[PDB]
Every structure is written in C-alpha cells, then in structure tokens.
Amino acid sequence: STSLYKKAGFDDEYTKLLHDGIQPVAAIDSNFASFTYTPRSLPEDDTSMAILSMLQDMNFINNYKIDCPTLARFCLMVKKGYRDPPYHNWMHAFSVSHFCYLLYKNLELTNYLEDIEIFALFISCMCHDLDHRGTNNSFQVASKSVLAALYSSEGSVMERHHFAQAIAILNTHGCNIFDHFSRKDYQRMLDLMRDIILATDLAHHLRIFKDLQKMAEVGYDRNNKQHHRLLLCLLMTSCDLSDQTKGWKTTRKIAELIYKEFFSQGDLEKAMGNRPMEMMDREKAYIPELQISFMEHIAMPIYKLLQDLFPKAAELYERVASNREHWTKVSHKFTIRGLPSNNSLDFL
Ligand SMILES: C[C@H](c1ccc(C(F)(F)F)cc1)n1c2c(c3cc(F)cc(S(C)(=O)=O)c31)CCC[C@H]2CC(=O)O
Ligand SMILES: [Mg+2]
Ligand SMILES: [Zn+2]
Numbered sequence: 001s002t003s004l005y006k007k008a009g010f011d012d013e014y015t016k017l018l019h020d021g022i023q024p025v026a027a028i029d030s031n032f033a034s035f036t037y038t039p040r041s042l043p044e045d046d047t048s049m050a051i052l053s054m055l056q057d058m059n060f061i062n063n064y065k066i067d068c069p070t071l072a073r074f075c076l077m078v079k080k081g082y083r084d085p086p087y088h089n090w091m092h093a094f095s096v097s098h099f100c101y102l103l104y105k106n107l108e109l110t111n112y113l114e115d116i117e118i119f120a121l122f123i124s125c126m127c128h129d130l131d132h133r134g135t136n137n138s139f140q141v142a143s144k145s146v147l148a149a150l151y152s153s154e155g156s157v158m159e160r161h162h163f164a165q166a167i168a169i170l171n172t173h174g175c176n177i178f179d180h181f182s183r184k185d186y187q188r189m190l191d192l193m194r195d196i197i198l199a200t201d202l203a204h205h206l207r208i209f210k211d212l213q214k215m216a217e218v219g220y221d222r223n224n225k226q227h228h229r230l231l232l233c234l235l236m237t238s239c240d241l242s243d244q245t246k247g248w249k250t251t252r253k254i255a256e257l258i259y260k261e262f263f264s265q266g267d268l269e270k271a272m273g274n275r276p277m278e279m280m281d282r283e284k285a286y287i288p289e290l291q292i293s294f295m296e297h298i299a300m301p302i303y304k305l306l307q308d309l310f311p312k313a314a315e316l317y318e319r320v321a322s323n324r325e326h327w328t329k330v331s332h333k334f335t336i337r338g339l340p341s342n343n344s345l346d347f348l
Helices: 012-020 044-057 068-080 090-106 115-127 137-142 146-151 157-170 183-198 202-218 225-240 248-271 287-309 311-330
Strands: none
Touching (some): 012 044, 044 068, 115 183, 137 157, 183 225, 202 225
16 A cells, blocks of 8 residues: 555665765755755755764764764664655655754854754754654544554654654664763753654644744743743744745645645545545545645744744745745646646646
8 A cells, every 4th residue: 555654674874974974065065055955856865964064064063072973873863763655754854954954054043042952953853753654643543553552642642752763762872962961961952852843743833823923023032941942843843844945846746745645644544434634535635725725824824933033034934925826826727636646746
C-alpha cells in the first residue's frame, strides 16, 4: 500500500562529513542566506554538510564548544530518524531548519532572544517531526497505536513522540552534543526543545493565538521571559510552514506531497471501516479550495503576526498572500477532486 513508509536502519556518510562537512555557506550557494533560497533544491546527500555549515556560520560550534564528530554523529542520527512518507521526511525537517537559519541571518534574532534559545530553536527544527508515520494525531487514537496509549491522555501524541525520539538520540553513545553542558543548562535545552516541539501541533497554536496577537499589539519585551516563550512558538510555526513563503512551484509541489500523504491515511481509514476527514478523502477533497482555506486561516495569520513584530519579514507575508491568490487563479484548470491518476500537479 501507499501507507507503508520505511526506516533506514535501527560509516561512509560519517567520514564524508569528517572530510569536508564544514564548508562556508557561500560555497553551498551564493543565495543560501536569502529568503529566496529554496533548500529543497539542495541534493539530499549535501544536507548533513549544510546543517554543520549553518551551525558553524551562526557560531554555535565554537560558542558552545560542541565536539565536531559528536555533532556529525548527532546530525546523521537525526537524518536517519526520519521515515520516507511523501511530506513528513528528512527533506521537510532540513527545509524547516534552513528557515530558522534565515530568520537568524535576516531578522535580528540576537536582539530578541538569548543565544541558547535560538540554538534550541534550530535543534528543535531538525528534530520536530522525527519518526513521523505519515498519519496525524486523530489516526493514532483511532488505530489505538502504542503512541496513542503512551500520550493521548496528555495531548499532542506525535509531538510528544518526536521530542522522545530527540531525547533517545541525545542519550545514544557519542551523540550527546550537550554532554559537556552544565546540569542547569543541559536541562534548560531539554525544556526549551520540549516546548518548541509541542508548539508544532496546530491545536496548540489555536490556543496561544490570542496571546501571540496581544504580544504583537503591545510590543515585544527583551526582558520579559514569557515574551521569549511566545516568540519561540510563533517562530517554530513560521519555520514549519516556510515552504509557503517560497515561489508558486514550491507551494504546488508541497500540495502534491501533503495530499498524497493525507490521501494514503484516508485510504487506510476506509480499509479500517472509518470515514476520513474531507481533506484526507481523495473522493471528496478539492485541493485548490483546501489550499485557500489553509493559507487564509493558518499560514497567512502566522506570517501577518511575524510582519507585525519584524518589519523585514513583510516580504514573507506578501509571498504567502501571492501564493494564495495563485490558487484562486488556478482553480479554473483544476476541475477534479483528489489528485490526477499520476499523483502530479505539474499540469497547473
Ligand atoms: C502538518 C501541517 C501543519 C499545519 C499547521 C501547523 C502549525 F504551524 F500551525 F502548527 C503545523 C503543521 N498541516 C496540517 C494541515 C495542513 C493543511 C495543508 F494544506 C498543508 C499542511 S503542511 C503542507 O504544512 O503539511 C497542513 C491541516 C490540519 C493540521 C495539520 C495536519 C495535522 O497535524 O493533523
Ligand atoms: Mg509535526
Ligand atoms: Zn513539520
């Protein structure tokens, strides 16, 4: 079935990073630190090297005295910790991480948050969807999975699992990048990573929205600890939906990947004798309308809030609005429900 997604495992890629894993960012691409860069254009084999390059460029390898081969092992473990569903794979975590690096390079993050908080945001970006199965939180509960048994009573099933997988990698032999960290700082990292990963659940975003709005309405406070907590949540959700800030071709390809993933879950729910949500039912979903709704209600407010706090982020919101206008303009060519027989949106 289209719902079966494999895990890589349980030396040549490590030695390659040990050879020339730290390359100056400009050698990767002259456009690498721009909001016009598309990290999905980077070959998958060069992504682990780009992670190190961004960490070095932000100076986190020297500021935190991170042992380079420990970081090389950790990155490869994070990469290996992703399965291969159409959307929630390593290439998604890599692109989300790159956008966190873009926010640091283009917005003045050091003038809003502590070095430790931005470093936590980046690491959380790499880990935020670890071991994702191509299915959502409702599916875990309905399929009565081990993950639902462990976490449903606490809420955010997948997000708690993703954080647990990040902790397991850290507690693996030679992957603890924070090994030399002090007891209070090591725990600070674990606590930041937990809140940041939990902020990737839509349910959470929907609950903190009024508070995000009020923070932007009043104005950011560099001395207010709660303001640092709320900013990190908005920044995490902006990294997670960052493919919408790119060109039309990226939003069109990401729609193709997410609906292939959503539709496979729906087919699995139908085989289980359950009725899927409309967006997960290939016989009911009309992708342009679903995209417009997702962009109006979820993506556009997140970037509108980011524009209110960071003036330099205005271009991001306008690209998201433009992509939304593009889906309305294209809806006349897309006259069918679901995806075409070949799973491609290239015809648009
Ligand atoms: C997983 C993703 C998402 C959305 C918001 C947040 C955030 F930032 F708000 F926190 C995180 C993650 N997602 C979801 C939808 C959705 C629609 C789309 F058209 C595109 C995406 S995409 C391309 O970004 O995968 C969608 C609808 C229901 C919620 C969610 C799926 C689910 O988890 O049940
Ligand atoms: Mg997620
Ligand atoms: Zn994600």
